[model samples]
Target chain A: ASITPARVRAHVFRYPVHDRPAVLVEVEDSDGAVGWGEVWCNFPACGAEHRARLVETVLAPLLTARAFADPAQAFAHLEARTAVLAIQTGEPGPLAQAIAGLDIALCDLAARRAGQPLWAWLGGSGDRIGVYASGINPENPEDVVARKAAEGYRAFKLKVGFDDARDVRNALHVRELLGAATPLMADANQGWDLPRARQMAQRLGPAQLDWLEEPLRADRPAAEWAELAQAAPMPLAGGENIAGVAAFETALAARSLRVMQPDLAKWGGFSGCLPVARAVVAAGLRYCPHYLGAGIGLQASAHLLAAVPGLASPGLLGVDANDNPLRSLLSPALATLHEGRITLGGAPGLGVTPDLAALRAAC
Target chain B: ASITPARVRAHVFRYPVHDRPAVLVEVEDSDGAVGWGEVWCNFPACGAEHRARLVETVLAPLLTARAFADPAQAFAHLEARTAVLAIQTGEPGPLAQAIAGLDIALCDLAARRAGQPLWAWLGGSGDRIGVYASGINPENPEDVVARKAAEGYRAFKLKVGFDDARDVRNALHVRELLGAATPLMADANQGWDLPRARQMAQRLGPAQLDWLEEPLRADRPAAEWAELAQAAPMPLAGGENIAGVAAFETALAARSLRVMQPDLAKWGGFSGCLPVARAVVAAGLRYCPHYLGAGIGLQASAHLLAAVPGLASPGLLGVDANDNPLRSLLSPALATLHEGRITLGGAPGLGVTPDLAALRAAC
Candidate 1:
């Protein structure tokens, strides 16, 4: 029993950025080894409870009794049975949430089972994923951008939608500080509706803007988005918010946006993102993953970059964020971006293992 | 507990079809009431495991607790706070299955909570979506295609993944039996790998083919597909297996394929597909959802269509052929395709219900 993972209790965490209490999933074992997984269930926009219910209902029953393997294998096993309920992308429901936990646990278990580091286990090839400074949030000084650019990240991503003037000011400032050498982009989190996005794009100017994301809502009809994309100074990039290939292809057929930024976590773990990556290359667009989770998510995203050839077009790692708090605990970490090209930690599976004891103790 | 949903379970399903399990999803609650949703997760070659895993990992978890008042809210809340995993798309992961399930459940719950039919809940403005006689699997016959076409489907989408000679013969054969009045489209499901697709276009002649799907992998490099689409007879069509708006837009920008077929489940739910729909319309392309599942998926697709405007371009709604063994159990008895046009049910949300207890008993 100690050797076998115990039934996961809630893997709770707080969004340092939002300061919201969210629960991921946790799978423990008889040996007191615990693995961390997420099923965040209570944020106003996070939808924690909805995710949690899924974990409690479908996945736990099957997974509770099973001997886990790897993250991919665990998800694969669960995905096989619940094909109908899974989302086109992102976490679908409890089963998926549970699978994540199981995957995490399994990875932890696999490492322990094999007595090796996950990165090494996954056949670590790279020492680090080049880190990109994903921090250019709203209303920040251009100097901060300059400082980050000075450090390493030749590329930076900022959050849009705070306000057009502020966003424009920030863009200009970032551009000036980072100089033309630093490629910069903005992430809207689907914040701007229409007029706002249009206004911001026009003011930012094509020269100032590299790529703009979710300038409109994810729900915006393809026609409007296409029009906007064609009209925009910077190329429009989205897909992190989209659910699947069908949606992606729809946008592609309609000529909606440019970059296909599918987050490995938000897309279908490794399995789901592969198709998106393939599609992105097929479509002749950039393939950069939208990774915005904890260590597990980042690691997964890094490994994802390993699966494909170099970006065909211009792209950037969504972020080299600082708010994960405990993100460092998962792995020694990797260089996400050093030069313009992003880097990933050469590791096995995801190349990282949860401090099972720490995970259990923390929970 | 009875009034408000305490828990939700998202399940991905893969039905038995020609050695493959057609993927779909189902969501349920403690009230013993279940809602079904579906996504067509036909893998490139290995598609079964995805569906199977979805139910086990994602969909089945919804039944663990009570339901939530907010479907979308729950979705967000759970995703952000309760789970470590993001609902994956692209690979069109379990979320496609899970979202389909949750979508159906939400529609059902919304309808039941409002005491209205699914269509009625969806706004009840349009009556029914036009139905096309879909799926002429190469294995199927002229008789089957002819008979189904005769049943009053406005248009028919034929499956054309065979060799060019066979495809041309099969298409010609179907056309002869169905007559010219019935619109005929072909779906090669990316079977015509590049050269074959091009060869098929040459062999079939431009006038004979309606629109070819995947003629090659829509997810392949754009240069190849663009040349193919440029040379193809029928306007190119694809997106059934794509996720993320960025991928969609790039494909469109490159003119990789002419027609768009974003599936609701395979993509994001209403929240996600709306953008693709808009983008498609913006690009002067029709917003046709690629769908193949039980009624719920179709219903959701219709609702999405209803929400979007003027999707009827040169003839829209390539969805038809609802007469199947499970028709009776479908809510509102399958969205009927009327006259030459397909309209949506003027209902709030989707009007659907399941023989839950009965099915459970059968299980």
Candidate 2:
């Protein structure tokens, strides 16, 4: 094959998250080298996909049998298609998902062919990262966070998008359960607006909730965010839904938020986030990726986390999660959360390869 | 099947963007009735997944044999398995997507079985809605808008999140084309911050701009939003990404935004947005469901649009030229564009049925 980019196969794997489904995908080269990627198709609003079909129908049909040795060539090959511009411009939703899988696979192939794993291949910073407890169910016990803490986790990210009363209660409960020693943070998931956000901040004042995640509604005005950040008792936190670079610069320059959550997938995968991550830092904002995808995504996140230059004092990781296989198996170091930190193995381009046999069996 | 709450099949879909995948999913009841959903699976950072094993191998085993008819009963039944709950809460990526699908499908099925389309079923006051042209491709002829207007589109929502200079240019261009008589709105998709947004507002002037859509970041301080709303001459708009009622309430109370744009798919589908929509009217905020999905989603949104009691002057109907079959087949009005308005027709439960045969043939 001479390593020419000739696409062949792609499939979506069904991973179980309790009753929910976690979607995983793999894209293979014509010669049988497969690269696996994971997506967090978990939100009731975000559409779930047949990762395999996504590739076969939307992506593969466009890529298979095409010759592409470089990203530019691959793109050129796509542009040649009469109807691919929509896929190229990202109007159709499936394209983005397929591209995401392809990017991961490409990264994997890039790493493996180079005889290096993704993490170390990218650059060796460390083998591990601190994993935080994301989304402590507001309706369930806050002790679940404590239990994780007991298991050696060091930080916490409590989901706080609920009625003020419940949100305040949940915030307090989580903080108490985790005690003051842990790095406690909260994700409003765009729950609070200035007044309500302020009120909640007032309620949680001393508990000193860290980084009120998505405090105001998405599409919030700039002035409101600035004032809200300045006014809120806690540091303003956000940036999970940002769609592109234009968005990145505006958010960064305004200083509307303090801690930034840039997920690799949405920010244009790995190729795109490089500059985005830097911009976050240059603006004096902490760079913690909003890891809402699944295991493989977490691994990709870990690679980025490792790549950043001394990311902010919120200074810990927001990319790794508690469990899932895509991340662990797909990453150069595999996305692993131990004690409270996830370790990123120093490899090139995000190291792990797809276990096709496993993927096929699952599918 | 006794129309029981017995769990059925589920599907996951993805729109793989250039480098990553955004996910969506659907869940079904025993008799082929279905609900569609999406998840907050931040891609490249979190692995997107299809946790069907948890369903078929896990929860399905528990729920399949059950006969409860209530959705809540289904939830309770499924949640009984600690594994389902743990995964459901832990990784919202898949569950969110699945839930969104289920929500829509359920609404669709209910509407169908009820013998009326979703718009009629949901109590929409108007039969036809003024649709806003949701997107503008770079190559989209500058006069394309005027042409679309010629096609009878009264409302136009131009997507402008790529850059500020281009965005301002596009805004001015669209406004000029639409003229003073036409309702012209601009959406930044979180493209600007306070200062940038302020600059944009100054450039466009309130009189020229009908409404500035998603000018501010999705999550900022409420005060910041209030400031932007007050500072900007045009009405401040947003809400397409907020996932719950509390988030909306916070934004509304802060006076953070004057217009509310809730996406049924993202915010617990119709069931959730229904309550939120009522709240919007009660508080006097203009309510519009952000429409940007396939036919199923678009029609679902149209139904919501008709159901809402608001002036179309403030509405930014999210219809585009995706040519989605789901919406076309399902729309009571066949998604026809007439004299600047898109109309929905008669039928039942979201108005149309998924031509599974067509899907199979197409797939």
Candidate 3:
């Protein structure tokens, strides 16, 4: 059955302890079925309200005025209508993020109407998907890694690129802490230029990292990425900031990366990322969904990872180990990871209903 | 001698009656020479503060850190540094606008230091440049056109694209009011699709418009624009929303326009637009500097228009007919037009300084 959106709302939460904000969008259909989605707003700290305002002011009217047979249709419609607006406002990122969140909600609503989990509806082989603890600060990697390990997170990624020497030291220490059997990754978060990236890639070679994430900035020329990929000791990984399919295809053609990480809440929800993930797997690269926000996006990422067909191995879903109440309170199922893998519930859609009452207090 | 910036400040003013806000940027070199510029914030009403914040937070540090021989050099340097930041923040427009203002300031400062007016320093043929009254509201077009004509304005552009019948009626009516001797133009502001644009273009053919401005959205595919340009009765005019040099070149190759209007404060200040303007004239097209903000941007636009060489005729400078105190008070020289042309002053730089103390009270 087609779902006709009745109301669309964006709920923003900013905790006193957390430096960043979390934005969650809610969409309710005419049949009273509800869906939840999240938007990435970790940067510019004040970006949460701005994105929420975009959702309310720009996207809501578009969604409510029409009926979408599926999420992809709605995503395509929104993209076409706002194609000129994005250029006019010089706000492609916020507009893309807003549409991404709305796309997730529309997908969730459709899955619920169909009475199937999103992964199953999208043709996943199984309900379980791989998971990794991410966003481990450079300050105390060993302590963070040890704690996550105890919590059944077998794979871990540490934040790097603050200080060159410290980054190498931390990577080596974390590698030793995790042992040779465990998978270890390091993310620079686009903090290094080409020279520094090459230097750090060589220095961190001893760490035997599974991949060096965003070793160079996202917008660096393809020639630079290609050059670094040839010189780097480990495989290059990036994609959260990659905006369109054309860019992803360009990266794929360059073969500069062995791991492709597309964030569901940042650029493309399932409707957009699913095709890219499939393409990544076809090209013999890992499709790890990059996420760092609250529960709704994390859950959506897990489901998206599970949904992609033809994975050599179960793709890893990035789970931020940082302390965020929105994560703990909204989706308690995140705590049920067994041996660094999360099993989706048989319940329809995302199989998680957020504790909106509790989360609203933070707003 | 190169000028090194010492202090950079962004001033914002919001009047109770005005629907939009104005943002002006100020740059002072180490030798105590000052320059003035403006950023366009005429659309989103609230965009003034955000752009001002970007100028203060992102651009100030960059400008204050370096010395530049000329505005173009500084513009290139800033573009390279912020290329990645613009992508990450999804704020290419605000960032571009902020940099545009700074670029204008740098140009003003350099010209002032050289002890010549900006147009003379840039090798312009003469100081007198053609002028046009723009932004005449569709409502009560006759009254506005009559008043502007009495004020020594020989060319006028009427705002259109509200109701189809009313648009045609107003165009024909304004045509009669201005007579055959006066140059008349109509701007649709990107409100029509291809079919409507074609229909309206044919309908308004009798009006003998000088050129139709923004008949279609700026980002409408080149092929569509090419089709419209081939079919429309009059020449098409656009550009304020066009971002990069590559895009301008593409539009030129497509031959979709006869008049190129680049807004300095919106995308490129003197540093960026000067090249495009030169290119537009070289391609045998009219180059009109598009502006509708405050005095700083207006003065900068005028100087830039006057600076471009090898024009078939002196290019027209767009001056808004709207009621803006920022323009009347800060740039009193604007009132000294004779026979529909404003002559540049022999004073150094832009030859005008904003009354910052009086403008500050509006904040």
Candidate 4:
């Protein structure tokens, strides 16, 4: 491999976020090096297609033509080139989302080029990272917890913010089912107001949740989030929607977040998000790579988490806790879970390639 | 004046927020009743003109035809309608900024319709609200402090965060100049990181300064910010960029802020920001309305601040230390500080009508 870009192809996967399609991306270098990535704008269903087109028509041509030694170089070139245009157009979100996918692709390419797993390439001394079962089970909460626990999950997170009373009831319910020792988390997806968030925090604070994830929007002023963190006994976790290093720097400085989750597929990728993870971990906070997408991206997340030193909680993997083929089908047996952890095998660059045909057909 | 939108006109005055055109909107209902408002997106220079265009073209048509009883109803209707479109087009900033101006205008119209001053109409207990001189002068920070103190200004804020040592020196210099009794604040404008902010906080903690405004960006995670807040001696003040009620809720819940500043001209107009002010006050935090724009929007902020019962500090009015004509020219003598306060004049809907010719020609 000459570490040169041969061709970069952008494909659209019609995975939906709240009825809107969540876009997944892949970039193939000229030397047949393929890397997987996802764009994190699932609102306004058109965003997926629009961003994919941006990559295909706008970003891909420029990226594929460049001869870069590493993902960092490509990312820097793209970022520097796009900074002015992104701000001028007031489309930082989309531009950043587009850049995120490319960054991941480039990083994955680099790791594969070196024939080392992403975690090891990033300097990891560990083979296993913790696994947490994340997602709310609308049907049977207790049963799902036990099943996930049996399937090898040390911690669990439930979706909240729709109904506070029900969420709390479920929070308390799950706490008992998981017992006092196992870690439980909650995410409201910014669903509640100050009053409701306060009430829920009051109830769940003593229950000893590992962390609350995005109970409210992460963009609120530092002071308001600070108050929410104080009101809640458990630590607050966020950073999925955070744009870049600058955004993460502010959040870390304000002490607004307790646990930091950076989405590699969303904004940072390896070039951008790596620094975020480093800064967050250096600041003595837990660094969980916020992820939700295809199997390869998840594998990329697992490798990244597997390599990080001193992670407080296990790497979170979104589990349906039901008959779900979407996640399982992406990599099949590669997504093996055992004893509350997913270990990385000796492989290069995500280890498993996603089924492009299935993904394209869905879109 | 009839409180109906039988005839609605959208006007854009040419005010600039840092080289970017600052859009000031005046929405007139039937019977010649006019209301004043300003959009908050002051950066990226084209924002003001662009948003004004949105009001003149896209928003005006729909707004003028609606027969809303009050500003609140109009706001609710507009917000509900645009929720989907804004997400689809990735124009939330401009759209929200446009809506903010309309909300303020409609609120102003309602107040004028009732024949009460904006403050009284918004339920104010005081005739005059306090004012504080902000924007620290770099050339002669000490001289500016003395000058402001001599001019009946009780509180002053200075700008820092460019360099750690220089900022500390300047902070000490201002402290020596202002003495211990007066309130002094610093606005980093999201300048420093955790270590530097901590170092600055340690040095300036015991100085008895009123507050430190945005030593770091407000979007930082809660836990790190909590550590900073705990490390700092004084109250942390921020919230000029906050958008809506949901955002305000998280900030208030976190208790990350001691003093909250919501810009009337920026994101939340009176109709939108009032509840935020009330929430901050109820939480026992100081509610300082953040305002820095043309004269009309400044007055709109003044009216809102005057109405707030028992506000901890005076509303922030951006006063340039050097000879600046923007604030003074927008509405002459309306911003004249006497005894360190701006009294609400007995006039309707922002009290002073901006000269349209001068404003339009300024652009």
Top DockQ prediction, candidate number: 3
Chain A TM-score values for every predicted structure, listed in order: 0.76, 0.82, 0.96, 0.90
Report the CAPRI category for model 2: incorrect
lDDT, candidate 4, B55-131, per-residue tens: 76667767877578678778777777666455434556666778887888888878877888888889886667667
Please provide TM-scores, in order, for all candidate models, with all chains considered together.
0.48, 0.53, 0.85, 0.56
Order of candidate numbers by TM-score, starting with the best = 3, 4, 2, 1
Q: Whole-model lDDT for model 2 versus the true structure?
A: 0.59
TM of chain B vs. native, candidate 1: 0.77
> Scoring each candidate complex against the real one, what DockQ results?
0.05, 0.05, 0.39, 0.06
**lDDT tens digits by residue: candidate 2, B303-358:** 78787757433454666643444334434453377776766777566655555546
CAPRI tier of model 3: acceptable
* Predicted candidate 2 versus true structure: per-residue lDDT over A1-363, tens digit per residue: 234555546434555554233455555566766555554455332235544445555556666666566433453344334123331122222344445556556656656667665556556455565566676667764667667666566787777767777767777776776678767777776655678877777777766676778877656788888888777777777666664566777888888787777655533556556667777777777777756555577677776666664444534556333454544444444325566666655444455545668744553
- Higher-lDDT candidate among 3 and 4? 3
Best first by DockQ, ranked? 3, 4, 2, 1
The residue-by-residue lDDT of candidate 1 on B1-363, one tens digit each, is: 232444443333322323323333444554655444555444322333444454444544543444465555555443333222332222234444455445556555655656555545544345555556677666655766666655555567777776665667778887777677666788776565678777787766633656777677544677888788777777788776666567777876776566777776665565556667777778887666645555566666766666564454632554435343233244352435346455544444455544545433322
Poorest stretch of ten by lDDT in candidate 2 chain A: A82-91
Better of 2 and 4 by DockQ: 4
Candidate 3 A-chain TM-score? 0.96
Off by over 4 Å in 2: A1-363, B1-3, B11-94, B138-141, B311-316, B322-335
Per-model C-alpha lDDT, please? 0.57, 0.59, 0.84, 0.70
> How many clashes show up in model 3?
0
